[PDB]
């Protein structure tokens, strides 16, 4: 029987964070079989340092950990797998520091056995803050890499197509989601990533439509709306209907509808004004101007602008495609028993011992 700790010699610490963080591959047999494993192992090391009441060793490990993680994300921050992996694991490390902090609040989902594994000599509340802030940092490098990959596909797949296609986009979305899943990234974190990906698709598409006269036709309205419904299906097939992802596409949807509605009578104008609640006046006017069949008369456009004067949001045309919804990492306790964790030989951590 073990207590669920890991001891290591102090001069071995640089070897520890080297194999466990610096040179640990985001894709491996052990990490794939047991997602979050490096976070669990790091936490078990902290437990024993705490159990030793060695503040200089606790400080050393906690410092090396964040330094090494940052060292990794600097060296390979262009790589989606690496970023996704260390986001997922930094998070799990944060959860572990909470779930076994010895604070009653973070202990409402623990077994009796788990509650025995709490820290006893040190309060790492200040460290958790640094770590959570590091996580926020990581989450944004993620969206950064995420966007640079999606971006060169969006116009082509969503618009210029009767390079990439629509299925290319769905494919890339399928790739992103599976990678995050395999890393054991919190489901609620995945949701926010998906919402962020749909917004980028929507914002880039709408902006390109608004800056191009060749894209504003009834035909494209038929095509855009079809493409959106393929993205809705993608959410529905992964139970992401409550991710808030769909709602971020509302401006694009309404712009696509606007291209299809009749645009001649006073009633047509009235209907447009109540339908397009998610588009700005500038956006509605721009689409009406670019339309290509009769053409939208200058007085029909005037009727629209006059009618919409009830709205006091300053006139804006372009969506911010670099906008990032503020990320939350809600506490997610694991039911994993630390006492039955072994150290797979492929991690190259033979120099540490279970306690």
């Amino acid at each position: 029987d073990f207590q669920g700790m890991l001891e290591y010699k102090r001069e071995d610490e640089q070897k520890l964070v080297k194999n466990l963080i610096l040179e640990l591959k985001p894709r491996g047999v052990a990490v794939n079989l047991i997602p979050g494993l490096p976070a669990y192992i790091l936490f078990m090391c902290v437990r024993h340092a705490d159990y030793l009441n060695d503040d200089q060793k606790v400080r050393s490990l906690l410092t090396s950990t964040i330094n090494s993680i940052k060292k990794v994300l600097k060296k390979r921050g262009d790589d989606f797998e690496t970023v996704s992996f260390w986001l997922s694991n930094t998070c799990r490390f944060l959860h572990c520091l909470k779930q076994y902090s010895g604070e009653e609040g973070f202990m409402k989902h623990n077994t009796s056995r788990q509650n025995e594994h709490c820290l006893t000599n040190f309060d790492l509340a200040e460290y958790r803050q640094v770590l959570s802030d590091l996580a926020i940092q990581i989450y944004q490098q993620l969206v950064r890499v995420l966007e640079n990959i999606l971006q060169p596909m969006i116009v082509s797949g969503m618009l210029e197509h009767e390079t990439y296609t629509l299925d290319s986009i769905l494919r890339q979305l399928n790739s992103f989601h599976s990678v995050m899943s395999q890393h054991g990234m919190d489901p609620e974190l995945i949701k926010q990533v998906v919402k962020q990906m749909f917004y980028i698709v929507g914002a880039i598409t709408l902006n390109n439509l608004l800056l191009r006269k060749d894209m504003c036709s009834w035909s494209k309205g038929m095509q855009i709306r079809y493409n959106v419904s393929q993205l809705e299906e993608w959410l529905r097939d992964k139970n992401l209907m409550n991710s808030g992802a769909k709602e971020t596409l509302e401006p694009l949807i309404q712009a696509a509808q606007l291209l299809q509605v009749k645009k001649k009578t006073d009633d047509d104008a009235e209907a447009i004004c109540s339908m397009c609640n998610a588009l700005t006046t500038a956006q509605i006017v721009k689409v009406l101007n670019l339309y290509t069949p009769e053409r939208v008369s200058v007085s029909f456009i005037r009727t629209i602008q006059m009618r919409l004067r009830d709205r006091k949001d300053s006139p804006q045309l372009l969506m911010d495609a670099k906008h990032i919804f503020p990320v939350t990492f809600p506490f997610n306790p694991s039911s994993l028993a630390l006492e039955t964790i072994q150290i797979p030989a492929s991690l190259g951590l033979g120099f540490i011992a279970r306690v």
């Binding site: 503040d55 606790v58 400080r59 906690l62 410092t63 964040i66 330094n67 940052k70 010895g102 820290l119 006893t120 000599n121 040190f122 309060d123 790492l124 509340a125 200040e126 460290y127 803050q129 640094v130």
Partner: peptide, 14 residues
Amino acid sequence: KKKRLLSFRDVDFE
């Protein structure tokens, strides 16, 4: 037992 709080600032890293 009272858990000794440890100090952590961004300066203590990097």
